[PDB]
């Protein structure tokens, strides 16, 4: 009995609402999307939040489908490096100095974020299960400066430690092309440090001490990993509680596959990053799907796939259809097949280990 837990479902993405390049092509089909995923053994998924507004959208979307989704949906709350300007070329570069000069607005935004996390963490049965996406993305300095990324990654890490309930939440971390700086910031929280200055006045919102340290059981999930073998070793050595998320983007080249082979199997989590990270014929991963198609009775794609302008007419019918170019959580099974072949770990074995590990982290 196979079970998948997609830790990277971008369910708020406009493509899942029928919008492509800013144009609506079909009615939103996310309930049918969830039905497709359930049919392909996806039991649970974590819906990503990337800003205060997007986290609020995720809260509301998950609530809106609680009685319609055959998947159990959880979500994150956090502000991604894309979006840290909401706490605050010429404009982006100017912001850090302006925040330091007058931190009052940022102080209020950090309070708003803390308050949201606490509100959502309240109920015993809450769908809010992880703080993130937070981290660093040095491929996106056109969205935010390095200084703004580093400061607001760190302030969010502090918030995630501010009380006992949040301190236990696993972190859903973003890292792209920023390994050394990402490790440098996290290492201070792994070992512990004292924030005397408290520029953003967080200690006004569990201890007067100013001492920040991750709980020894807090899990640290590095989403959508595509780094080098050297980067991987830096992450694994940071903490035994570092986990590595693997999706189709993590499997594109032979180098990527070699790196994935080195991830300890019990520290590997599976995700689609849907609607992104489709496993394509031009990827080194495809050969394993080809093998499964040929020798193992595997259906690729999992359901008929049509162009975006052809989906709408299919939506009254009972049969389920995908959109060409739009990845989905029902493609978890493809990631699992590839990882199992790359690692020479029996497929059912891999699925079982990843399922149990993911459930322990997120619930
Ligand atoms: Mg992602």
Automatic annotation (TrEMBL):
Matches recorded under SUPFAM superfamilies: Metallo-dependent hydrolases
Binding-site list for Mg(2+): 133, 223, 273
Keywords from the named record: Exonuclease, Hydrolase, Metal-binding, Nuclease
UniProt-listed Pfam families: TatD_DNase (PF01026)
GO cellular component, one term: cytosol
Gene Ontology molecular functions: 3'-5'-DNA exonuclease activity; metal ion binding
Disulfides per UniProt: 82-83, 249-277
Family: Belongs to the metallo-dependent hydrolases superfamily. TatD-type hydrolase family.
Protein name: 3'-5'-exonuclease
Source species of the chain: Saccharomyces cerevisiae (strain YJM789) (Baker's yeast)
